[PDB]
Every structure is written in C-alpha cells, then in structure tokens.
C-alpha cells in the first residue's frame, strides 16, 4: 500500500505524527505567545529530518 | 485564565488541538505530496480563525 | 512506571476512575438512603478487584 | 443520509452545537433559547 491508499491512521502515522509529537512536546515546554505559529515554524524547521 | 500554569494536555487542547483536528482531517482527505509543509501552511493560513 | 510523578488526571485515571465508574453506576441504579456511605462501602468491598 | 442517528447528528449539527452551547454558557443571556437559535442561523454557513 502506497500512502495514498493507506487507512487514515496509518497515513497520518507515516506522514506527520512523529514531527507533531516532537513539535507539541517542544510547544508544551516553551509555551510561546503564539503557539500555532510556533508549531508551524517547528514543522518547517524540522521537515527535512522527518522526510 | 493562565495558560502558562495549565497541565500539558489542557494547554495543547486550549491552544493547538482544534486547528490540528481540522488540519489533519483536511490532510487525511487531500493527501498532498508534501504533508508536513502542507500542514504547516494550513496552521499558518487558518491561525486567525482559531 | 512511577505514579508519584504522573499528571493529576492520569494519576486518578490509573488509580480510582475504573472503580468509580462502576461504583457510581451501581449507585445511580440503586439510589440507597445513604449514598456516600454506600459508595465508600462499594469502594472498600471491591478495591481488591482493581 | 442512511446513517445511524448518532452519526447523522454528528455530521450535521453537533459541531455548531458544541460552539453554540459553549458560547451560551459563557454569555448566559436573558434569552437562552432565542440566543441559541440565532447562533445556529448566524453561523450556519461555516458548518
């Protein structure tokens, strides 16, 4: 099964779940004035390390 | 109303969980070539409504 | 896994929530004259099973 | 659709009800029912 044909859970697990775990961890730790912006920026700053 | 002192779960639920609900829903539906970039862009593009 | 350092919600969920679910369920069903005493007695009589 | 009751209501009115009753609980107007109906009509479009 390619991504496209995966069930919802498996797809999200193979795409964004790890980086979301790390992102939310850092977010919860720092608690910046703009949490959403911070999370998006984390996603961008680590995309390459998570494919 | 002091975020700073909230438990982790309550903090994330009061800050990023709703937009993440809608974001991952859209992501799972569309499945773009670059999911992480697409997601970051979704968060930035809908930040104001959340 | 240590319990001392768990967040409050996770701590209570791993200790008393299951027995409370069934306890308050039975309480709501029966509605005895002394609710607090009955609940405490339920907790004491079924603690071992949890 | 052909959906079970819970799934139908979950797909139709539950989200807007979540936000609506939350706002209701926050404001607590003299007109709870009218306020709620108005919330549903004014925010119908987003759902």
């Amino acid at each position: 099964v390619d991504l496209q044909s995966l069930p919802t859970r498996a797809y999200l697990d193979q795409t964004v779940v790890p980086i979301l775990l790390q992102g939310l961890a850092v977010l919860a730790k720092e608690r910046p004035p703009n949490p959403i912006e911070f999370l998006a920026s984390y996603l961008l700053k680590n995309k390459a390390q998570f494919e | 109303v002091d975020l700073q002192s909230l438990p982790t779960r309550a903090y994330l639920d009061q800050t990023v969980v709703p937009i993440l609900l809608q974001g991952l829903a859209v992501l799972a539906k569309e499945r773009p070539p670059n999911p992480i970039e697409f997601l970051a862009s979704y968060l930035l593009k809908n930040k104001a409504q959340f | 896994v240590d319990l001392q350092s768990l967040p409050t919600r996770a701590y209570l969920d791993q200790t008393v929530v299951p027995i409370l679910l069934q306890g308050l369920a039975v309480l709501a069903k029966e509605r005895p004259p002394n609710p607090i005493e009955f609940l405490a007695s339920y907790l004491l009589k079924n603690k071992a099973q949890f | 659709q052909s959906l079970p009751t819970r799934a139908y209501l979950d797909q139709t009115v539950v989200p807007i009800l979540l936000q609506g009753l939350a706002v209701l609980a926050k404001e607590r107007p003299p007109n709870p029912i009218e306020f709620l109906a108005s919330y549903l009509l004014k925010n119908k479009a987003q759902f």
Partner: peptide, 24 residues
C-alpha cells in the same frame, strides 16, 4: 510529560479517523 503529548495527539488522530466520511 511526553505521555501527555502522545495522549493529545492520540485524541486528534482518533477524532480524524472517526469522521463519518471516513467510516461510512
């Protein structure tokens, strides 16, 4: 509390996979 983060993300994922459009 990494457990809290995993619990949160689990909530999110659960909600997403149980969207009626994904189930029916």
């Amino acid at each position: 509390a990494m457990g809290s983060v995993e619990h949160t993300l689990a909530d999110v994922l659960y909600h997403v996979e149980t969207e009626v459009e994904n189930l029916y």
